[PDB]
Structures are given as structure tokens and as C-alpha cells.
Amino acid sequence: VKKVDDVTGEKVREAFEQFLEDFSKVYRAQIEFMKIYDLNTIYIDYQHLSMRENGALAMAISEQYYRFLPFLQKGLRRVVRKYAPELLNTSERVFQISFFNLPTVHRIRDIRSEKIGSLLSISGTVTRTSEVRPELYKASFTCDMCRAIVDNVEQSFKYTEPTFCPNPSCENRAFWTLNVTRSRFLDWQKVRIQENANEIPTGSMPRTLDVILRGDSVERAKPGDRCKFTGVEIVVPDVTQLGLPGVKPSSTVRDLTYKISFLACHVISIGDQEVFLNSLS
Amino acid sequence: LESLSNVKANSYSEWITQPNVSRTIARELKSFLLEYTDETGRSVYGARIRTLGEMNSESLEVNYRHLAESKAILALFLAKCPEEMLKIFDLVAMEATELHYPDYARIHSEIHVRISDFPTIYSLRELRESNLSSLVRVTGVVTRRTGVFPQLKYVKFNCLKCGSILGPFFQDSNEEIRISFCTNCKSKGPFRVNGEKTVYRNYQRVTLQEAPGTVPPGRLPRHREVILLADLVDVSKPGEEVEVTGIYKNNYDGNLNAKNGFPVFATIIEANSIKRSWTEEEEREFRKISRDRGIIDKIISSMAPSIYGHRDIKTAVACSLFGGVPKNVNGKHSIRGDINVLLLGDPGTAKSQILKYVEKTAHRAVFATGQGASAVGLTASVRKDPITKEWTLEGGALVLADKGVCLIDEFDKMNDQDRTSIHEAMEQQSISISKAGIVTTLQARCSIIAAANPNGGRYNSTLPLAQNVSLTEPILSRFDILCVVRDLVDEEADERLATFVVDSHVRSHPENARQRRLQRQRKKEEEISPIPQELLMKYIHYARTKIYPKLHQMDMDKVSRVYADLRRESISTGSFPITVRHLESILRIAESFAKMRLSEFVSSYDLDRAIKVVVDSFVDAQKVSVRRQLRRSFAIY
Amino acid sequence: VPVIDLNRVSDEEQLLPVVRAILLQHDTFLLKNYANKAVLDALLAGLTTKDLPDTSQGFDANFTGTLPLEDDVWLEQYIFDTDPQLRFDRKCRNESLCSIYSRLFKLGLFFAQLCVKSVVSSAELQDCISTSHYATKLTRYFNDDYVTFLPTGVLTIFPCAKAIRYVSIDEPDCLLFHTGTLLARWSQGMHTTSPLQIDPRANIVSLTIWPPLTTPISSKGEGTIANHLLEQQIKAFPKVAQQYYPRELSILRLQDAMKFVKELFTVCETVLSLNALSRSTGVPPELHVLLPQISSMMKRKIVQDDILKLLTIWSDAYVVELNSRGELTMNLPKRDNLTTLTNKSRTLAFVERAESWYQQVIASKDEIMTDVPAFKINKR
Amino acid sequence: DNTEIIKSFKNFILEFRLDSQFIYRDQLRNNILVKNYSLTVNMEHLIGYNEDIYKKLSDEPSDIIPLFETAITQVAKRISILSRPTFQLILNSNANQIPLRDLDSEHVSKIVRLSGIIISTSVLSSRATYLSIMCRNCRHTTSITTVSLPRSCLSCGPDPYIIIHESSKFIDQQFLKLQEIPELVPVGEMPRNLTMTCDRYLTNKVIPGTRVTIVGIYSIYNSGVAIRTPYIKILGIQSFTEEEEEEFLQLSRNPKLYEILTNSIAPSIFGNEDIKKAIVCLLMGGSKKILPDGMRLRGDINVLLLGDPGTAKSQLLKFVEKVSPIAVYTSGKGSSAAGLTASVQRDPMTREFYLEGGAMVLADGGVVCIDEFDKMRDEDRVAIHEAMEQQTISIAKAGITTVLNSRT
Ligand SMILES: Nc1ncnc2c1ncn2[C@@H]1O[C@H](COP(=O)(O)OP(=O)(O)O)[C@@H](O)[C@H]1O
Ligand SMILES: Nc1ncnc2c1ncn2[C@@H]1O[C@H](COP(=O)(O)OP(=O)(O)O)[C@@H](O)[C@H]1O
Ligand SMILES: [Zn+2]
Ligand SMILES: [Zn+2]
Ligand SMILES: [Zn+2]
């Protein structure tokens, strides 16, 4: 039994690891820096990502970012075992990537369904924030009929029990025991940003949006600040679509409502002489 | 076995859970409880165990340093798998107690051992995923307290398809356990908890909030939830400041996975031990300054040194920070101890920036503004419990400032109703409420420092104070010291004040590096202050905790005749409501001066400073034509 | 504190079982309804108001006389021993003090015998204290901040048990009986004692009881009981010991410094162990970060200078390389982070190094300093 | 085995003799004559009559009190047959009560005694006690006396039985709310509230604001992760030393009694003899009288302090709070008409709307100390007018109206 292989993803990861081993190796120095300082997330400049293969590597990574993420995660976390295996230890292999420095800064005014799944950066005034919470990034379960264990049970945007007991000697399904120790969790936070005053013409009204922050990038959002985010747009189920006019599709009955949200992996706020001077040509 | 537990085959949880390892460390623990090397003090733990059975309690406090000194890895396992170590330690303690007092299991189920003196402390803003399931020590303020309700501990189920009873399951307070397969039937049918064979516990949920003076600039107060179990309930009440050591775990599993995007949980702390303290190097350093001749003028000169003049106002700040003696006379009578101060005068006289200094100096300070504060937001608020759906109360600014100070800016400009609720706090030091079925009283022991403006924005020196402000005699009566400020014009006064301020902006302006720059800061403190500011904060704290000067009625004629004299001159003049409450300020402010010297006795000199400050206040707040006459009438004082 | 009442417990068959039970659990007990208590109260008033100490007596190497102290406090002390081999010629000058002393010694000597008979299993020393053979010290504070003291006797007697702390004692009508080090030492583990805290300016008279001081501390040791009391008096009064025992005071004072660095090393082991397990990596933390936590464990202020003393005694204790920030650090030397057997071995290693280095200093003919010099980390 | 428990109970009713009389047999016989199907058993007689059954009842009343109901029913019906329904058990006891804060997870299913004040009551509801059912598939009939209907027929598919309504029996039940005395509650704490349930003859005896003594069973029931709401099955509710009586009688015989007590009121303050004496009159209060038309004269003495600030007027109220056995202290600003007087709120435990008292309801039968009386709103004053001049509070909220007495 052989599963389908994504040849484009394999090509991307091969180009991804080759970029990591050749970029000058400041990023590996950052990798060693993370091992020294016990860090979780590595940060990569987009323009650094966009200066290999004339930037075509970034383009494929950008427009289909949500698809290709695991390949880059494998690409790096193989490198960490190659050069900093201690980061794999615990007291387990939590690892994150957070990009930044995008050229385009799209407005809340300019959200299109075409942008779903692509990498984009936006800017908006914060109005409300949520308290930080742990997010079940990856879970694991132990069987109920027998006592086999299932690891690396990823929860992609929903709660998901394992669909089978791996050993054919057992027939357990839809009945599992959740581990709270071998499992792993990650930080989580919601930010409610608002369209800037200079964007909305007179008479028009400000648009509002909810933005998700996870990892160490949480709590870098404070009310009243002009924050700037970087990430990808992802849709989530909605409950307020009921009662709207027009024919609504159905699943078969099951509902298929959606609403637009933006997920951000990096946080920064727009604002000592020599610090400012060197940033200009 | 022995010393074989140090082998690390896998993560610490993979090694402790092994029964052979468990027996080894359980055997290893049994030696520690019975014998410990405390030299002349013998094995105090045996005495601790023996006295606990005598006292009939479950609180075996265990010092971290003792176990860490004797048993290296046996203690370090408690810092990474505290739940596992505490599970077996209870059993080891249980048998140890029965050696001295057998049949302890007859009345007591378990020994809820308490860890103490744990050396690593984290704030509520430090907890991360890396510290999950560990043992953590935090300090905070009890804001909201829920009731006491039972919770399951060991759970047994009855199968619906057979009469058999399922085995016991420990309730982790993490998830409402729901089994899926019967042991006998192997069926997935219904199950119900067998209440007649289920062991409960006591559960109370308490909220801890950052200390008022520790909130970072420009952020809401971070706060967490704490789980008190096993007779750890009712250890603290609203307004108390506590430090607690517990386990940092996650238990909010439910609709959060769907009601909010993606599966997320929420964090709690399961408290193990809680506590609501000076080395020799501190007290010995205090007494050196204490023996310095004339210490009172050193403290007063150090009250916000970057403000020129206003010495008869800085003394009120100095006296209020130290406070008096909250004399609960014979129990049946009570008198407030803290000194209330009202700052009044023209704009441009630093009536507010001083209140931006009392906040940074007093141990616990809550700051408020006149129009930005509401009556409900100051005294107490009403909430519904998210777990038990009951009416609960949450403390306000005054409740937070218990054993501290409350700072109100622009006291006059607030609406009348918001100003009205303050009346009880300034005399009762308590909040009385009756709302939505809640009938109770809280503790609001806090001095109030208020800044205000006269009617029209300028002080009319030709009119009485009672006519210069929109307030009234009642509100003014609850104050002890009133600091009238005149912005009169004079070249000599202006030259001295301006040359002080122009130098203040020179120094407050920016310009082993830690040590070198910390030297520079205390160097500038020496330029302007006779006392280093860090010590003064501690010195005030030490005085408030240890010093309670007593009284001898030697100067009774001196004070009584002053009281009679002040009353006589206010019989027909628009002035302060000089009453018995105003006399008490003289004695209490005398206590502060005595408590500045760390003396235990109210000397004649202390009243001499006390009478001069109190009498001068009444003289200064008079019309011009009358002020010059009382200037000479009270020259004796 | 247990109370002994002569109205119901005054016979030897009554006192001995009671004293034995008290001393197996406690070190201090009270005497009630003594016939001389009423006279003692009158005698105390005469001493504290009329019979003031002879301030012109001076003070001697025998730690007897009227020693002037700080805050104009005077201490009138006398020592008496039956054995003439010790020259305690400076007998008590005031008869009212002797009146209290005789009354205390009248029943206290029998009680001192009771204390020895209660817990001391040595058959050779059952009657080590008696009328024929006894040694007593008369102590009297005087004023013309509690002081921690530990008498070296078998039993200590106070005519009034008030303002005495160990928790305070508020029983003026009962005499205080406290056991010293010698009874606990000769108890063979059956009884132990603890030091007390008293007001040094309360004008309180006190009495302590030994067998004749020429008796050795134990048959296992060469020094006599007088040597043990001499060491305590040298430690208690450095100004007196400066003229007569300069080197001895330096030797005795240096022992406390050794205990300082030993417990300091123990604290560093605990703190550094927690720091290793709290991180996924072994990078050494900077010293200034650890010091606030170190001082909390020590319950007193600890700075860089005290830490460097550990390096002088044991060079292989830690790795203290200076960080690129220019800040000192410290870390465990062992390549594998820690092992409970190696932790004890390294703790014993410092103990052996310090003890040998202590013996090296005391064996030197030069006069001895009472502190460990600090190590100098190689500057970069 | 359990027949001995029934037999021992039968001896304790038919044959137990006190004061040379069959008190339990006679009082049960008198109840039968009254047709009151209940018996008041005194626990102090039970311990003196048979300690062995007391051990079982005190420790495991799970089966004993079912035996109590069935044994008394058999014995009482035997008496009825001799002279010419299920009899409710009522327990009267004088044993020591456990503090409401002292209830823990150890007294589960144990009979406990409590004392407190009712703060809210519920409306009556009917609960089944005897049922008869019929199978819908085959008309098979049977009788049934928590209880759930059978899943299969005894002769039909799952759950084949339906209830025969005209041949079934039901009993009434009430839900009560109890909390500890606020005087016994230290400041900074809200008194703990406890849910109680009563049925049949024990219902509607107490209104909100009534101080009671409780004998009941401590237990829990599901309604947090596993936080079950505690509740009490009510078994019996009741609502000075000889030397103390002589001591206080001697106090009444003191020649300077009036002046001594007058001085005793706030001795820390000087003079003020007149205001002290009026407050003394406030402590005693007047004597109640009832008009022949049925109206009641208000016996409370209400006094207003209306003087200059700084005259210890606030301290005078505080001292009364510490001397009045029933004392409530509240400020004018931090009070509301709903907070002061009665209110209607829905109990989340039983999902029903309960009538709930307020501060002016808790202080019934005692003294309340209100401060800054001028600072409270007129609506609060208006509600006070009814309490002051009629000792009643009328509630009209949502869609329900009621009147509640308040002797404050
Ligand atoms: N006596 C003084 N010494 C130094 N600075 C002063 C003094 N009085 C006023 N100031 C300055 O004037 C300002 C007064 O601010 P504020 O306290 O708001 O005035 P107000 O008295 O109206 O509250 C402060 O910034 C302070 O620097
Ligand atoms: N006759 C008196 N004897 C003793 N203390 C008094 C007397 N009159 C007033 N006081 C003092 O007044 C204070 C109480 O005043 P209070 O009634 O609270 O003022 P207000 O009327 O503004 O509420 C107490 O601290 C008390 O010591
Ligand atoms: Zn399986
Ligand atoms: Zn089954
Ligand atoms: Zn049928």
C-alpha cells in the first residue's frame, strides 16, 4: 500500500532544503541561535526567500501557501536533526516558521475569495483582543478495545479522532482515549482589527475583520495600535448565513456555510538616530 | 534498588511510572520522612508527623531545600512530574503517620502533603507551554471567589446491560470521563456513575489577579484561575494578597473546539500549598539609619525630591504613607489608622503628579480619575458565576487597595453620586452593598489622597474654604490634612522654584554595564535625596509591619488646650468642620512621626511635630483679614 | 513549657519520672511553688534597685567581674568551682546575689542531679554534680535586640521566666529551668537542647550548672569542660578574648566561615539543577540572574564575592566563563548534566577540599584570618 | 434481617413508654384521629431506646428510612384497624448541629443537623409516589411504587408500557433555599447558600426570611467538570441555661440597670446620654398589638440621626450591629430597592422562578442600620414606607404579584 506522492511538493522541499544550506549560512546560525536560547519559531524574510530561482520559489510557495506548508516543515526539521538535534528533545518535535517583510500590504477593503490559500500581508487598527489560549496543534490517542497507541494525530482546523486502529488484530473505531501528556499544544490568540481611517472615504464606513495569532507571536497586539500581520487567508464555518436570499448549496442533509478569516504568523507594529538613518538609501 | 533511578531511558514520565522504579523511590522517600539531618534540631519531620496526628490535620508541610539537600534526584523528579511524585509521597506519608498515630485511616483518607519554600517563582504573565504540568509558584491578588461544592475523586460506573460495577477511575478534574466498553459485555451501551460507591472531594475555584502596582504600563490586569482542593478552601478572601504553589495544567475541553475556530483549551492552576520575612542584612541596615539624629526631616525631604517647596504638603504625603495605628480599641470599638489627605489649589501646582508618585512608592496603590470612575466601578460590581450560575460579587478600586492607598484625581469634577459612595470608605474602611440578593461587607482599609480644583479654577484668598469649593463640611470632615495651595506671584519665590525645575528636566532627561548604570541612578538619588529610594520603599514597608508605637498621657494638657483653642476660633468663622475627628488626626499623625523613628513610644517631640502640622493647616485656610490675627494668637504652638 | 509544682511533685520518686519524660521531648521546664520564690522576688527587687553591680570591678581573662558593654550595658558575672585547681578567686562581691545563688543552688543542685539521672545513661557520672563536686556560674545583666546564647552547662536556672524567647515565655511566678549542651552531649542521644533568646538589658540574673570544670568533656576527648566553656566565652566576648586569646578567637571564628561556604555550595547545586531541567539546553545563565534566587534560598544577601570563594577552595566546582555580554556565568562541569551519586560525590569533594584547607590554615604559624579569600577569574 | 429493624421500630412506637404513657403509640393514634398521616419521632428517645439501630441510621440511612416509612405505615394502619397511604416520618432532635461551612465531601448520605435562615422558597409541585402502567402492545397491566418505567413487557417492543393516569398516586414537593446567619459570617464573605427540598406535610411551613433549625440528610445530585449541586432531604425543622436565667434575672433586679446599660452602649464615646437611651429603646423595641379588625400595629422604633458631621453618628450605628442579635448594616448609595426589599429571580438549580428576599427581608425580626439615608433614591424610600408603616413588602414584577411581611 503506497500513498500518493506530491511531486510538486517534493520539488519544493528539495529546493527548500537546498536554499537553507546555501543562503549566505545565516539562517543556520539562527537555528544554532534558537538552540542556544531555547526558541520555538524561526523567522524568514520573504525577500530572502524570493532571491533564489529568480524568486520563482517564493511564487509557488506564496500563491498556494496553505498546501505546501508541511513540505517546508519537513524540509527544516530534517535540517535541525542534521545540525541541532537537541531542539527535538523535551525535558516532542514542536517547530514553527513565521515569514515577514512582504511587498504588498492589502487592505481590509480588498479581500477577495481568490486570495484564499495565498500568502498576503495586511494592516489594520486593533479594536479588541482575546486572551491567549493553548491550541491542540497535534494530538495522540490510545485505543479502547486493545491498548495500542496512535501518535501524530493532527487536528487540521477541527477535532478529528483516528479513523482506525492501526493493528488489524483490533477493530476499534470512533472510540478513543485522548492523551494529554504525549500530545502537544501551541499558543493561540484572536485579534479584531479594523480598517484604518485613511482608507475609508468620507461617507463610507470602516470594515472589520478577525485575525488569528498563534505561537510566540501572541500578545504582541495591543488595543489602539496600528499592527501589521503576515500570513494566509483561511475560511471557517459560519452560523449567521441563515435567512439570506438566494439559493444555498447543500451536502448529501448537511450545511456548507463559510466566512472569511485571516491567519497571521508574524506580528509587528508601525512606529535612535543611527537606527533610523541606516534604513534609508 | 537505590541510585538506579538516575538512569534516563526516556522522558521522566516514562521512568517514574514503572512499578520497580516506583517502589525504589517510595522506599527512598520512607527514609527521608523518618530521618533527616537537622543537627541539634533532630529529625523535625518526625516531629512534624507526630504533631500532625496530635493536631488531627492533613497538612504535612515539606521544605523543598531539605529534600533537595539530602536526596538530589528524588527532589528533581518533583520539579518535572509533580503529580506522580505527590501521588506516592501521600502514601509514604500515610504509613509514616500511622507509625506514630495508628488507625489514622479510620478518620482521615489521605495526607495532603504541602510543598513549601519552592525557590522558583513566576508571575501570571510568564506561564508558557514549556512549563505545562510542572510545579510553579505564583503570587497575586484574590479578586473573585466562588463557593465550595463537592467534586468526584474516584468514579465507578454501572453497566446498563449487566449488574456488574465498573472499576474505579481517578477524577483528574480534566475531562468528564465517559467509558466506551464494558469489562464484561464489551458493549458500548449506556453507563451511569455509581454514586453509592464514589469518593468525592471539596472543590473551590478562585481567581488570582496581578498586584495593583505590578500591572505593566497600558495593559489590562492579567488574571488566571486557581483550583483549590482538599481542605485548601477558604484560605483567602477578596482583597487578600497571596502566594501559591501548584501545578499548571489544561482542562477546558468541550465546545471550545467548535464554538471558536480550531480546537483550543484553557489553562488553570491546581494549587498544592498557599501562603498569604526579612533577613538580618535588611533590619541591621535599617537600624543604622534609625539611630541617625533627626530622621523625620530626612524622610520628608525624600518625598518626591524632584518637586520644589511644598514642604507642608510633602509632610502630609510622608505621614500618610507611614500611616497610624488602626486601633481596634478593646475589639468592640474601631478607629481608622491611615491618614486622609486632600490637595486643593490653583492649576500648575503639582496636585496630581504627587498622586503619580504615591502610586509608585506605596506597596499597593490604586489610581482613579473623577469623571472616569463610576460608583459601581469603585465599590463593587455584580456578576453571575459562569460555572454555578449564581450571583457573585467582584471587588472594585477600594477593595483592591486594601492595606494600601487609593488615589483620586480631579475629585471635585466627578458627579455627585460617584463622590457619594466614598463616604463609607473614608471612615469605615469597608464597602457595604445590597444588590441582587447580595448582602455583605468587604474590607477597604486604604488611605485616600484626593486632588481637586476650587470653584472657577482659581482660589479666592478673600473667601473661606467652605465657600471656595463645591464640596461640603461632611466630605471635608472625613479628611485629616487639607493642603491649600496659592499660586501667588513673587520674584524670589519664582527664581528658587524655576531654578529647581529647570534642573529637574536636566536630570530626568536621558543622559557590568548593569552595575555601572545602576551606580549612576543612585548617584543622582544622592544629589537630590538623603535616602536611597529603594530602601525607603522597604523602610516604609518594614515600619508598617513591625512598628506600633504606644502612648503615655504626659502631654495631655498640651493637646487638649490646642483642641479647645482651635474650636474657639472656628465658632464664628467660615472654616473647616473642626470636630473630634480632627483631633484624632493630631494623635494619629503623631504616631506616624513616632513610627518614622521606629520607636515604640509617642514622645513629647512627636506631638510637637504633630501639633504644628495640624494647627498650621487650620490657620492657612482662612480669609486674609483673619489669617494675620490667628498667626499671633497661636504663636505658643 | 512543662511546669513542675512542688505541691504535688517534690519527691525524687515523683520528680525523676517527670523530669525524664520532660527532657526526652523538651529542653526547658518550669519550677512552681518553690519555697524560696517569694524571697527571690524580694531579693530581685533589691538587686535591680538598690544592690547595683560593682562597676569598678573590671573584667578578667576568667570571664568574671563586671564587663562594660554597648549601650552602657553592664554584665556582672562570677564563676565558682569546688576544685581549687581552677583559680576562680574573683568570688561574688554582693551578698544579695549570693542569697539568690544559694537558694537557686539549694534545690537546683538536686534538680541538676535529677536531670543527669533522667537522661544520662553513664553510670560513672550519675552523681557527677553534688555538694562536694559542682561548678556554677552566676550571671547578671545590668543597664546603667535579643541576644542568642547557649549555655554549656547541664542545667540553667532563672529566678524569673519572663521575656525569654526560644515564641516568648510569660510566667514570672515560675522559675525557668533550661538544659545546656553538656546534658545533651552526655545524654547519648536521648535528649537535645536548643539556644535561647533573651533581652540583654532586662537586668535578669541567671545561673548555669556544671560538674567541676576540670572534668573532661568526655572520656573520648582530651579537652576539659572548662575548655568547652572557654570556647563559648571567647566566641561570646571578642573584646575580652582579644587581650588574652587572639589566635584562639581567630581559630574559633573561622569555623563559622567554613559552614558558610559549605551550605553555599549546597544551595548552588540545588539552584543549578533546577536551571538545567527548566531548559531544553545547557547554556549557562548569567550570574546576576541567579543571585536573587540564590539569596532567597540562603535567606540572606549573597553577592559575586561570596560565590568566588567556592572557586578558591574547589577549582573544578563550576564553569564560570564570561559571556559575550561581559557578564559572569556559572554552570555544572560534568558533561552528563547530573547524577545523584555524582552530586553527593562533588558535595563531599568540596567538603574534603574545605576541611583540608581549613586544617592547612590552622596549622600555619602565622596569625589566622577568619575568612576565605576570593578567586580571581581570568580577565579577557 | 431487616425485619428486626421493623420489629424494633414497632416496639419503639407501640411499646415505648415515657412519663408512664405510650407516648408514641398515643401521639400516632391521635394523629390518626386527626387523619394526619405523619409521626414526629424524637431522636433523643431513639438513642435511649435502641442504640444499635441508631448506629445504622446515623451511618447508612439509605435503607433505614425506607424501612421507617413502611414500618410506620404498617403500625399506624394496625392502630387504625384496632381503633376502627404512606405515613411521613418527622424527626425532632436536640443533638449538636454541624456548621454550614463545615459540610464536606465526607457527610454524604449522612443525616446532619443545621441551623439557618430561609432566603427563598419555591412553588409546590406534584411528584409521583405510586404508579400503575399498561402495555400498549398487549394491554398487560402492573403497578409500580430514581424510578423509571420498564423497557420490556412482562407478558412487545422497546418501552411498551404507558401510564394509567386514573389509577396512580402523587405527592407534593417544595424546594427551599437555606443560608447561614449573616451575624455568624465574618466580613469579606457572602454567606453560603444551600438547596433543600421538602415534601407532603413539611411543605409551606417557612417563608423566606425565617430562621430555622434543620434535621436532614446531606447528599448531592447532578444538575464545572463534574460539579454536582448539593441538596438536603428535609427530615425535621424547628422554628438558655438555668444559671443564665438567674444571671439575667439578677440583671433585671439591678437597681441601676437602666443607667448601667445606658453607659454600656458605646462606652468609648463620651456623654451623649440621650441618644444612647433612645438607641437602647431601639434594641428592645415596642410590644405588638393587634386591632380587633385584624390590622397590626408596627412595633419597631425607627430613629433618624440628622446632625452635623463628625459627631460619632456613624459609630453609633456600627455599635448596634454588634449588639443586635439580628443585625444588617448597609449604605444608602450601595443599595437598591430589589437589593433592600424582596425580589423574584429564577433558580438555576431547579429552573424555576423563586421569590427571594433582600436586605430588608433578612433583617426581619431584628434591626437594620442604613447609613446616608438621604443619599438613596426615592423608589428605595417608597418601598421603605410600606415596611415602616405596614411591616409589609409588595412585589409586582414580570407577571406575578405578592405581598411579604417584614418586621424590620
Ligand atoms: N512645586 C513644584 N515643583 C516642581 N514642579 C511643579 C511644581 N508645581 C507644579 N509643577 C509642574 O507643573 C505640572 C503640574 O501638573 P498637575 O499635577 O497636573 O497640576 P495640577 O496641580 O493642576 O494637578 C507638573 O508637570 C509639574 O512638573
Ligand atoms: N463623644 C465622642 N466620644 C468619642 N469619640 C467621638 C465622639 N464624637 C465623635 N467621636 C469620633 O468621631 C468619629 C466618628 O465620626 P462619624 O460619625 O463617622 O462622622 P460622620 O458623622 O461624618 O459619619 C470616631 O472616630 C470617634 O472617635
Ligand atoms: Zn485497538
Ligand atoms: Zn456490562
Ligand atoms: Zn406487552
Numbering used by the authors:
A (entry chain 6): 100 to 123, 134 to 200, 260 to 420, 445 to 463, 500 to 509
B (entry chain 2): 183 to 458, 475 to 709, 739 to 864
C (entry chain 8): 15 to 158, 186 to 207, 220 to 433
D (entry chain 5): 23 to 106, 133 to 193, 204 to 213, 236 to 303, 320 to 335, 349 to 517
Paper text:
The MCM motor of the eukaryotic replicative helicase is loaded as a double hexamer onto DNA by the Origin Recognition Complex (ORC), Cdc6, and Cdt1.
To further understand the role of ATP hydrolysis in OCCM-to-SH transition, we assembled a DH loading reaction using MCM-Cdt1 bearing the Mcm5RA variant. 3D classification identified two distinct states of a complex containing ORC-Cdt1-MCM but lacking Cdc6 (OC1MMcm5RA). While all ORC subunits are visible, the two states differ in the configuration of Orc1. In conformer 2, solved to 3.4 Å resolution in the consensus structure (or 3.3 and 3.5 Å when locally refining ORC and MCM-Cdt1, respectively), only the WHD but not the ATPase domain of Orc1 is visible. One new contact is formed by Mcm5 WHD (unstructured in OCCMMcm2RA) that engages Orc3 WHD. One contact is lost, with Mcm7 WHD, which touches the Orc1 ATPase in OCCMMcm2RA and ATPγS-OCCM22, becoming disordered in OC1MMcm5RA. Compared to the OCCMMcm2RA, which contains a three-subunit ATPase spiral, the Mcm5 subunit engages Mcm2 in OC1MMcm5RA, capping the N-terminal end of a four-subunit spiral.
